[model samples]
Target chain A: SPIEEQATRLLKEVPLIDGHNDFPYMIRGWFRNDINGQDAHLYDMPIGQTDLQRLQKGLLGGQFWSAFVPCPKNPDKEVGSLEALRQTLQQLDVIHRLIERHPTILQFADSAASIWSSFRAGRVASLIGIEGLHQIADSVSALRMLHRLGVRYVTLTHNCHNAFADAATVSPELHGGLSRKGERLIRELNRMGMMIDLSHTSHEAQTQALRLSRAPVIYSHSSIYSLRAHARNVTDENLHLLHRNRGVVMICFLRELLASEADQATLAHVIDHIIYAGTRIGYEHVGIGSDFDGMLRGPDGLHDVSCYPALVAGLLERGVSEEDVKRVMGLNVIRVLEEVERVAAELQGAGEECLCDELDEVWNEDIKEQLTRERERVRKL
Target chain B: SPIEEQATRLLKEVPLIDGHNDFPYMIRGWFRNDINGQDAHLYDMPIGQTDLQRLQKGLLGGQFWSAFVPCPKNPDKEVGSLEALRQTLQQLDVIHRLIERHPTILQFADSAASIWSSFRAGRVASLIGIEGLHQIADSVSALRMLHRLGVRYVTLTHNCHNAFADAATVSPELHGGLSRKGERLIRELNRMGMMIDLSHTSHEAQTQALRLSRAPVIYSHSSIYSLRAHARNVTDENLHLLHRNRGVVMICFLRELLASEADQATLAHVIDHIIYAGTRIGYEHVGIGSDFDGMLRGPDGLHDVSCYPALVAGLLERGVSEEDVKRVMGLNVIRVLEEVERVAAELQGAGEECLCDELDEVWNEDIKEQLTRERERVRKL
Candidate 1:
């Protein structure tokens, strides 16, 4: 009873700031990106681990809704990459529309202040994130534009290799880690105030980006690979670098990432992953990222959006310090995002220009000479 | 000499506002969207009928630089469509970079007032236009985002069919004219102050859109079908309909659209098409849209961007009145853009809601019941 009371109090005081949730994509799948007057479905979702009522019951203070499109379905990699970008827009539009239409329940936020303000106003502080670089279609301009549209963070890869970074699940390490373009993009991501997300990226890519980025990056949804031995989980080697980067690894709730056997995962296992990362790196570098609606079935005792309270109560019952519990609940991520924004201002205020997309020269003097010669021939005609 | 002087006077007094030019895609092709220090290439292009220096020499006032990607070269239609959207962003990014980097030569403008202000500063008012709906990747939201990114016009289709509309050159009419989605998007485009471009849309689609659109549209780049029976040219029936819609037919200078043969096409042939449109549809409905860079070769006498002055002189020498010449040069396009904005404000003020993409419900009561039961069991666990 005391654990429940402590969990409720902590939730009210700090509001759980989840690093990632795929509710937008859920709407894309279930509602086909149309939530216009779909309150019944919103309140009682049919096919996912999320619903408005459950979200409210869960007492979620804030969320970074994942605007994820699946890996490019086209055989041609280029076409697949581009389609992802377009699909990302559709998901973002739906997310915005959902938040706007449900003003009383969800308030869109892009910063720490907005998140707090929205919580104060008695609404979910809904932030946005894209799941992969492919969603940007190999354009920094579009990435910048996504930021303009209130997308705060971007995952480097989803489930496949992109031009920028390699995915953890994919084999035959493309670029071995970050590509030349990926390294340059890290600087621009920091300079432009976009929070670099390391979730779903390879261990090498994570190490590379974490070292290269000037601002603090985030593992939006990842667990400890040292415990679970899953590729999608974060390796301790990178977690140490994450500490040096002063970033947060918002531990994932996916069953596959939490345990060797999918059937054995429970809410306690989720807590163990958090405690493992927190104990190793300190609570300052740990937070919760449910990845709700991302998985078909959530872990035991954390079956849906409504089960967050149980996980919170479990943490308190486990004898974790209240201060550390508070940090894990939301404070750590909020601080990371705040610092990320601060670094952007410092660099941008100092007039540190972001790296423009570096393009190689594609033509030479001979081509120009022939063109001029051809123009001369046309002149004679 | 007197006619040439008058032509120069008209050009200076009112800038020549071209509706569509694909110089951005040319940069993508020739330079691979890299213009780092290729000012020389831009100053005098090797393969296209445009260059920054010649553009300045032409004394052009404003332009809708076409941000076009070729219709998906991919095998899958969906993949190709989505890829087009991504390539569209790349092209869009390059256009913005091209303008931003060369502010003295090209000032980015999105409205009628901005156009005039840019021209007043002795800069070419460069605005953005996408050549096909395929570039939007079947997402109205992305299309809206493109508008936010300063894309002022969107052609419903290029020389290919999309979900929204059918193109002129495409055999099987996908949507006959405008599909249900296309018709709805027309209202949304008008509501958002985006100019509808009817350049490569099928005749049926054009007729449907022209009838449905609340705002006046433009044929960004099309010639007279009566004069030349090409698929890409505008028909007399549609031209008459365009008059009723109060739209402008910005004449095209493509060789096949003008003279049926590349070599025989000249500045005179271009003027002839403009005059023909002007005589039939009124001077206010006629303007120029050189499909430069879209083609490798150009009409004689109108060899490149610098030859604009020669075309103005040619029109003047052909007994075109000063007021009419001014209308054809710029006033008509400006009027159309302003009216578009005005119509948007009116419709938006009147609470005419934009149509959202309708979607089918993906869940049934059976799925909902199963989920509800499963959630209760998880809660008890």
Candidate 2:
């Protein structure tokens, strides 16, 4: 009776969307195969957390797969940008393969209507999100390529400053905000229907990115800095801005985000930030991104993928209405998805083409000559 | 008379060739206004260690300018291989520009004859060496591109293991020896008139590379591991292999290379390794690679760009002759350069022949389609 009660309450109250997870990384790592079912980690378990069984148990309606690329430690000696681009494409291919393999359980959703439709059909709607700005590789052309790869959300910075913008881990010497290049990246990302995510970006970088982005900015997965003061958490000023811009802030469930220290991590700790975010920014601008499988010292009762119902019950006990809880759990993120899809559809209907004329016109004669010589050199080799 | 005596005695008795220095890094850092150049403490110095003035003051006749690229911390991202190739080209361009800008001080030398000629002309003969295996970016096509860029020597690893081989900082969890990919890289480097450098490579990796490469090997910038247990220092077993394989061991000047601790570094400490290396492996196999500006903790007396005299005096005091010292300093490295140059010339004379039938077939494909795809993919910003 208690299990049924919890299940009924969860079904009635929370409609959850996870803002970021590494499903593709799992598929690639475990499957040793592409997402196309060619060989994927679908069956294999990575040592950390989060897998298909866990997702189903979590009652996740939809999620964004954070397509993360590790930044090269040595900035100067990385495998060339082409190789980096190729590896990203390979990972994207893995994602596509995974979606194709699990069409019955998971549906690819690029818009809010589709996400809701998928949820009604009892399937998890998966979306793509690029985790680092370096994925653009200092090239607008590469950014376009990523757009074609179905990246609907892009975090402007991960843990390090890139050519375009500074990360939350700001250094005094480097450009500390959205650089001129970063501003261009924001404009381009917006044009491409990619929502700019400011989760890991610095205050200065987030401000610059927010001001520069044509579309509403989302904090893909973050918590309240006012409550926790973690570098990864978003600030009170930014939360208000998210509400003002018609964007959403997904409350991260990582223990560190929920509480300042490990000792304070509890359902109460997580609810405190969620309630604060809901109160300060409005329930429409708040959602849950549990960050399952991501490294976090999770709260006691909400320890694993099976604890979503407890989290929802805790919220209900904290005086959150069922409707508000449902919206905060998932519908808010679904709305943002719908808006992005609507813009995409409008752009498509307008028959907008890529602005590649400048790319064609601006040629480096020296580089061309060098390439020609390289071809000859390779021939002899 | 004492100063002249010191100068004459040191010049004639001590062998000195800068084994390793990133001249291009300096050029790009100082001139291109990159982050490393702007913030790096090393770049804050008045002159780069391998620049014309320092080379002259040190009486350095030959130097290897290491072409290095940063390795991506995350391999799954969308950075391109061409980015590294382009960075190498940009750095090479800077070096050539420097040569043109300071013709009186430096000259590019491709052969032993040219090196001597440059010395006679009162200029340092600048040679190009590629540092990281990642520079090839896991593509044979990219490897060929490097040869055309005029890179004659390639260190198989730096501080990290690459697709090609294990680094001295070895991990048994990963492929512990020369990887299949690394063997292919070594074979291609051999076929391309590129000399193999095994400085930062693991003992297993070095052994496999030595066996695979057709040309003699080089420990481009290393010290005796028997003397100092640092990962950068070469072991006695590897030194014996170099001796047997007719490879050259260029002594590095990093204080850590000479002594176990930074505080123990002295002119005497450096000379001890040189003497030990020469005795264990033979004088002909030993040479100088003064890591110079590349080291923060150089031997106390051999500090900065102007301490070659002190180093040479120490070597001279150990009873090394001028002829052997000159050969140990630059002649062995010069010999390898000449051998590589001869191969390049022979290949050139063979006239426009494709190295592999597969490459020829690649050329025959729809050139227009290929060009379009490449243009769409490879074009920088």
Candidate 3:
């Protein structure tokens, strides 16, 4: 009863900002990105772990609604790569529409201030994150556009190696860690205030990016490698580097990432991962990232969004301090986002050149000549 | 002076919403979509005709700022098609940033109400239109997303033919008229309330689209083919069909579309084209489309955005009635937009099925089994 009382009070006091959730992609899968007159289904879905009523019951303060598209699989690499970008937009569009259609429950938030405002208004602070760099279609310009469209974080890879980075699950590593272009993109990502998410990235790539980024980065959804020998889990070496970079490691609830026998995993294994990181790197550098709706089901006792309060109560029952619990709940991620913006502003203020897309010669000789003639005519007038 | 006074009065009275302008693409070329601390250049651009100063000088009520990307030129057709969609987002991003940075001068508008509100606030009502279906990468889902991002109209083709329709300047036609997919897209567009733009489309495509669309469509920028025998101009048959469909033909000011010898074209030639359309189709079915920045040079007097007032005065001087001139200036396009919204609302109200993106098999057998197992666990709870 005391643990439950404390958990409720903590949730009331601090916004629990989730690092990743694929509810938008779930909508894409089930509703075809058309939620028109589907309020009944959205409020009580038959398939996925997310729904409006369950989200409220969870007492979630904020969420990074994933604009995640599947990894490109077309035989035509170009079409496949670019199709990811289109799919990304569709996911982003649906997320925005979701928030708009349910304004009383979810309010769109892009910054720490907006998050607080939304929380104060008694609504979920809805944020957006793209799950992979492949979603950008090799265009830095599109990446910046994604930021403008409200994507706060971009995970470097999903399950495939791209021009930017190598994925943990992929074979025959591309660019061993980050390629030269990938190294350059880190600077732009920092300069533009986009949080660098290293969740699906290879250990080497994560190490390279953690050191390269001027701003504090995030492991949007990950587990402890020492606890579970999965490639998707965060290695002890990278966790140390993340601490040095003053970043947060948001512990993930993906069952496979928690235990060798995933069927044996439960909410306690998730707590163990969070506590291991918090104890090693301090509670200020730890947070919760459930990866809800990314899978068919979550671990035991963490079955859906509504199970968040139970997580809080469990952490308290484990002797975690109230202040520490609040930091893990959301304060750390908010601090990271705020610092990311500060670093970007400082870099932008220094007049750093932006990475631009290579322009093809769209205007030919005839068009060029005509433009000159027109300017001459305007000068005469 | 009296005609000039009348033109000014009409511009203020009814928001003179131009059908199309490619200022955003010009920014993409010159600034590389990086408008950071570039306000000085934006107000007085050294390259193309549009600038904040000129836009103010024009006293133009509103404009459909063209999020126009170049036609696909990549050797790989798949890459080329999908690249347009990526570029479209970049253009859209820049247009939005341009408006955001110059809030005192421009405000975004998506419908008739927002246009009037912006005009009343004395800010230019900036609306968006993508100049080609190629920009959607064959995804109706992307097209709908574009609409969600404030794009009110979509030009069916640019200079290249797509799977949807044929373009005017292309050699061998892909779709002789609207292909099956193109015809189907028309119904979805109408149901979603997106205005179909016929500029740069083949004559047959225009006819097919004109009849197929449930909502009033527009030639965002085109000329009279009887006056100028160019492939890019609209024919008498299409104009009659447009009248029957209650659509608007927004006359373009491109020199080549105005005269057989483009250099000989002037403000009088542009006026002649407008007068022909208005007299033939009635003023309610005609409007102005400068196609500014789409070309290198305009006819002599209509050289840039600042020169809009001069065109207005010339129209009045040619003995066009004030009310007809107002209709040509913008009221007609606004009416068409209103009707488009009305038709979409009615269709949506009747539960018309939405066109959806084909789902790929992202969830494998293991994931499906995992979900079933998880749901069973939840049931036991």
DockQ of 2: 0.03
- Decreasing lDDT order of the candidates: 3, 1, 2
Provide DockQ values for all models, in the order shown.
0.29, 0.03, 0.35
Compose the digit string of candidate 2's lDDT tens values, residues B144-230: 544544567888877777776778865652567788666665555655678888888887777676666667778888888887787
lDDT tens digits, residues A1-381, model 2? 554475456564435777887656544443333232332334333333455665677676788877775564545544433444444554565566467556777788767777778877888888888887776555554554456456778887778777777777656626778786666666556656777788888877776666665567688878899888877888877776676677888877788777657756887877888899899778888877766645523576665555677777788878887778888878888777667666656764564442220211212556445534533442333
The lDDT, on a scale of 0 to 1, for candidate 1 is: 0.84
Candidate 1 TM-score versus the reference: 0.78
lDDT by residue (tens digit), candidate 3, B1-381: 787888888888988889989988877766677787788988877667888999999999999999988888889887888888888877887888788768999999999999999999999999999988888987876787788778999998999888889999998898898898899889999999999999999999999988888889999999999998999999999999999899999999898888889889999998998899888888889999999988777788888899888888998898998888888888999999999999999997787877766666666667657655765666568
For residue B126, model 1's alpha carbon misses the true position, in angstroms, by 2.9
Per-model interface RMSD values are 5.5, 20.3, 3.2
For every model in order, what is the number of clashing pairs? 1, 39, 0
* DockQ order of candidates, top first: 3, 1, 2
**Number of the top-ranking candidate, with lDDT as the measure:** 3
What TM-score, over all chains together, does every model reach? 0.78, 0.48, 0.87
Error of 1 at A275 (Å): 6.6
Cα lDDT tens digits for candidate 1, B332-370: 999999999999989867756455554446467786676
Model 2: residues >4 Å from true position, as ranges?
Answer: A1-15, A27-46, A75-83, A343-381, B1-381
